[PDB]
A paper describes a structure:
UdgX excises uracil from uracil-containing DNA to concurrently form a covalent bond with the resulting AP-DNA. Structurally, UdgX is highly similar to family-4 UDGs (F4-UDGs). However, UdgX is unique in possessing a flexible R-loop (105KRRIH109). Our earlier studies allowed us to propose a reaction mechanism of UdgX, which involves the formation of a covalent bond between H109 of UdgX with the C1′ position of the target deoxyribose sugar concurrently with the uracil excision from this site in DNA.
Residue numbers in the entry: 2 to 207
The structure:
């Protein structure tokens, strides 16, 4: 059942976000500071979904406000997409993490498929509330949430996909997670950034 009994019968994003603050659909709510719901409005035509809030998001209450968010903002700007017009959220709403000794931050840990499926009712409610024309899946966890646990982002870059069990049958575009472009060889990061821009443009051109 997961988060299902915690999701209210409302499409109002403010009411949904407040209810998510109360969610116990999996165990992640316990150590996290708060739930991080999506940001944006129901008029948005483009919904973007990441994996989970990170250290900064857990305390800001907003998605994509750390380094990965800054890289995403650079990609959106290059793609001529206004972040204010998007609805941005994550597959899981509570930060899953650990700390390492000497660490400079809390380290995100990958949600289990079990936690993703537990939290999915929130994603469904968000999609029902926003009725996006296109959904950008940033990274493996988000893409698998809607396209299946076996889905490989690397094999379907910037392809326009459509599956039958998604609300409103929006177009789906799976792409690299912005966090992946933060580190690595310069030429590899630059090529990967260009591909993210391409994928965002495909989505915006739906
Ligand atoms: O909101 C956020 C921030 C970092 N990484 C994610 O997947 N989502
Ligand atoms: S991660 Fe999702 S399902 Fe789990 S407690 Fe948080 S909001 Fe509920």
């Amino acid at each position: 059942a997961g988060a299902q009994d915690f999701v209210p019968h409302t499409a109002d994003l403010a009411e949904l976000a407040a209810a998510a603050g109360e969610c116990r659909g999996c165990g992640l709510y316990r150590d996290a500071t708060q739930a991080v719901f999506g940001a944006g409005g129901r008029s948005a035509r483009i919904m973007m979904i990441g994996e989970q809030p990170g250290d900064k998001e857990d305390l800001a209450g907003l998605p994509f406000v750390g380094p990965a968010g800054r890289l995403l903002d650079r990609a959106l700007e290059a793609a001529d997409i206004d972040r204010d017009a998007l609805y941005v959220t994550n597959a899981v709403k509570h930060f899953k993490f650990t700390r390492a000794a000497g660490g400079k931050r809390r380290i995100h840990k990958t949600p289990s498929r079990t936690e993703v499926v537990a939290c999915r009712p929130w994603l469904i409610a968000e999609m029902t509330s926003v009725e996006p024309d296109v959904v950008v899946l940033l990274g493996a966890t988000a893409a698998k949430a809607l396209l299946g646990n076996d889905f490989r982002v690397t094999q379907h870059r910037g392809e326009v996909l459509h599956v039958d069990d998604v609300p409103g049958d929006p177009a789906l575009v799976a792409t690299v997670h912005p966090s992946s472009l933060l580190r690595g060889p310069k030429e590899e990061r630059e090529s990967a950034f260009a591909g993210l821009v391409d994928d965002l443009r495909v989505a915006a051109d739906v």
